[PDB]
Scaffold this active site. Structure first.
Site: not given
Ligand SMILES: [Mg+2]
Ligand SMILES: [Zn+2]
Ligand SMILES: CNC(=O)c1c(NC(=O)c2nc(C3CC3)cnc2Nc2cncnc2)cnn1C
Length: 313
Positions: A68, A107
């Site tokens: 991420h 994110d």
């Molecule tokens: Mg996410």
């Molecule tokens: Zn993502």
């Protein structure tokens, strides 16, 4: 004004394909993103000085986690670029601006932990946002960076265009909460099949943009097998760390997150392709036919996992 970004020939050609991998050279990713904004939106959409400052603040606010991370951000934006380029006339100028930025920011400040883990930990963010916890955090971080002096890439929009684009970005980022994907796709499935799907209906466009965000977010399952297989290691490194942290709270984790059950990964991938990815790209292909290559690449990777189970790799 007359300053184009240009890529080496191989990148210039392959960046147009859904299965493009942005490569291991971190320092080329900002330029790859600007290139995509210029071809998808125009050379005028953003003040290059402001865009560059925005990109570098966004990069700074992604963390050094296995999956991420900043590479995921640019990868998810590239999939959106490929969807928008293959569906030229279906999307407004505002939508093309907002969605590439939404994907880059979706994110922001991810710690490598699920909404479930935040709630079981009793993380402060879980008190501030009861559902779509991380995703409301990601939109909060996006607005924060937009409001840094010299970072407002939307300043040249009218007041109402500004409100519309922030609303596109908010819904786009909230939609990346996979808990919301299941019902969003079911509703889109019903609408396409009964023939009630209407892209001039704002509530329907929202749903379609939501599915596009799920599809871009999951696009590591639509790469060539060698990319997909190596990315799978990165996401499992996060899952297993979360599972470790669950065991520290005295909770047996779900098998997906238990590093003692690595043997069950290949079958776990089958479930995920069959329950999530294949359905996601099928409904997307039905609504936006030129996105079929994502479905084909996804089916190819399912077949590769079937081969792993049959011991052929
Ligand atoms: Mg996410
Ligand atoms: Zn993502
Ligand atoms: C709902 N079921 C699940 O989340 C699930 C799994 N999730 C994944 O493998 C996976 N999840 C995600 C986002 C939802 C977090 C993204 N990518 C994923 N996989 C992947 C594979 N190869 C390359 N890149 C990414 C596995 N087993 N289960 C029960």
């Amino acid at each position: 004004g007359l300053m184009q970004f240009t890529l080496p020939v191989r990148l210039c050609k392959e960046i147009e394909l859904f299965h493009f991998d942005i490569g291991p050279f971190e320092n080329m990713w900002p330029g790859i993103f600007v290139y995509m904004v210029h071809r998808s939106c125009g050379t005028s959409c953003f003040e290059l000085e402001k865009l560059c400052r925005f990109i570098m603040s966004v990069k700074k606010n992604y963390r050094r986690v296995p999956y991420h991370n900043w590479k995921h951000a640019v990868t998810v934006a590239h999939c959106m670029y490929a969807i928008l380029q293959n569906n030229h006339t279906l999307f407004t100028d505002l939508e093309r601006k907002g969605l590439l930025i939404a994907c880059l920011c979706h994110d922001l400040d991810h710690r490598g932990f699920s909404n479930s883990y935040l709630q079981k930990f009793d993380h402060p963010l879980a008190a501030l946002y009861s559902t779509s916890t991380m995703e409301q955090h990601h939109f909060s971080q996006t607005v924060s960076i937009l409001q840094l002096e010299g970072h407002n890439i939307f300043s040249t929009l009218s007041s109402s265009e500004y409100e519309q684009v922030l609303e596109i970005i908010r819904k786009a980022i909230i939609a990346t909460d996979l808990a919301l994907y299941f019902g969003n796709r079911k509703q889109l499935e019903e609408m396409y099949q009964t023939g009630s799907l209407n892209l001039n209906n704002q509530s329907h466009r929202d749903r379609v943009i939501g599915l596009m965000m799920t599809a871009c977010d999951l696009c590591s399952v639509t790469k060539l097998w060698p990319v997909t297989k190596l990315t799978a290691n990165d996401i499992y490194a996060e899952f297993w760390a979360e599972g470790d942290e669950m065991k520290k709270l005295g909770i047996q984790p779900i098998p997906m997150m238990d590093r003692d059950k690595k043997d069950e990964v290949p079958q776990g991938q089958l479930g995920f392709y069959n329950a999530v990815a294949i359905p996601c790209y099928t409904t997307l292909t039905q609504i936006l036919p030129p996105t079929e290559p994502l479905l084909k690449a996804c089916r190819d990777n399912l077949s590769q996992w079937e081969k792993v189970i049959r011991g052929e790799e």
